[model samples]
Target: MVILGVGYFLLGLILLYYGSDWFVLGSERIARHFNVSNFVIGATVMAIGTSLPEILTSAYASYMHAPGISIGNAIGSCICNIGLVLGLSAIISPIIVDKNLQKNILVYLLFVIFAAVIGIDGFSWIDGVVLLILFIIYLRWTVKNGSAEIEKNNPSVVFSLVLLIIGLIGVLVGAELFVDGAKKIALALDISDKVIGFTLVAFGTSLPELMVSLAAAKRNLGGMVLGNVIGSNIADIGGALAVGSLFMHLPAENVQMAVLVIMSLLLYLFAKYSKIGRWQGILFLALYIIAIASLRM
Candidate 1:
């Protein structure tokens, strides 16, 4: 039993790390090949790459009829990204805020509110369709108004396309192992699926963001650090959660929903000064710990 728990969880995390990286690299090359702007690639493909774990895992769980884990993991990942990933990254090195990101954050918060309202009656197919529609609009607006820098790449389209498929397969395999491992641990410990999803599964999926942000922080790439987190969070709701909702009805937990909203607001406040210093990092980490401890209350 111990081996079952340890092996799947650890292996899943490792796969998530590499799979997201491979996905990002391949997707970037593919987008560049199509003459897409760099910012659009960053906002959409790279963000979606890092978010693939959550999206795939959630959708898989929903497919398996485990809506508790499915929806909980998606929203919980947003909290984890801001509190755990950003907190640690900022502690390592202060993250500089971009004005552009601030605007997107507003859009993200609106979705947070949208998800909250949708979750009130539980996520039905209608909710899923609406969110999906909103996501498309957001994508279109991002492309139409985004700043441009075009570069034609030398890599053959076939090579990048191959990597894209391979990366997706890696994420699929990893997500299966991840959810399997997570369910076993939850059952053995008699933990609620929602709580398990929020903490364990959410943390597992957010591993890529944590790694990428920390690496960027070490290099003092502040824009990259914040961008990765915010972008992943946005995609979490716009893409992952919407996908999950399409599979099963995810009844909203009131406390967790409130926590997500609070965390998002706090994230905006923390960086309102245009930077996230170590002190802000400490505060976020502190609140994250509190959030975890209170999650089951």
Candidate 2:
């Protein structure tokens, strides 16, 4: 049973990675054809693309009536993005943050506030609408403030539309399988969905960010790494949860909510300096183990 579950999980991960990659590639082609700015496409499409796995996975979990998995997926992805992805990237190459990085903190700040207010009661579609609106506003702010270069090479338009549909179906089905496998594992081990969602499932969905950050760090693009981590974190909290609870009212708890608060604050504190060094990365990694350990307690 466990082996079967693992197989399903691995298959889901493969699908999500390919699904999101092609999904973004297709969208990138469509967006560029319309003379859309690279900044807008990067902010809207690519940023969410990198985050597509978590967004779809959590939403699928929620749709499957596993709110524990849904909420856990959102929080776990955020923590993993910071604790694992950022830490590993920093260890490989210390990141030098952008001067305008301060403005981007707005998403995290807004998340902290919303978690306290709406998360306490429960996150429903109404709350999701509000959060999604905030996400839109924040995304708009980023595009106007930040800059990213557009690639000159563009793909064929007609083919891209087909790619878009194929990608949508792949990710949708993948998320379903992933969540189903996760549920089975949770039951087989007599563990709660929350625990598995926050740990194993979360780790699986976070693979994309890990790959992206690792590649950027190798190239000594610390700024890019930081941007990717922070941007993806925002998408996890702001975008993922927004869609995950769009139909269901997910009950938020103190442990997850409280941890989220601490993580966000810690992230901001780390941002105080211009650089995130190897020492900081070690510290971040340490906190990850400690934080996950806290779940069992």
Compute each candidate's TM-score over C-alphas.
0.75, 0.71
Against the unseen true structure, what C-alpha lDDT does each candidate score?
A: 0.72, 0.69
Best candidate (score: lDDT): 1
lDDT of 1 by residue, 1-297 (tens): 757976887787677666655655565576567665444655665567778888887789889998877777777888888888889988888865666666666776777887787787788767878887887777777666554555454458878877766765566566657767877877788774754455555676776677556655666656556656777877787778778888988777667778888888777766665568898888889988898777762
Kindly list the per-residue Cα lDDT of model 2 for residues 1-297, writing each as its tens digit.
877777777787777667755555565565566555433454465457678878887799889997767777777777777788888988999865555675465455666667657788778888778877877777777766654455434347778777766765556556657766777777788785653445655775676666556655666756556666766766876778878888587877657677767766776766765458898888888888888777742
Models, CA RMSD each: 4.4, 5.4
How good is model 2 by TM-score?
Answer: 0.71
Model 1 CA deviation exceeding 4 Å by range: 1-42, 149-199
Q: Which ten residues in a row have the lowest lDDT in candidate 2?
A: 34-43
For model 1, the run of ten residues with the poorest summed lDDT: 146-155
Model 1 reaches what TM-score against the true structure?
Answer: 0.75
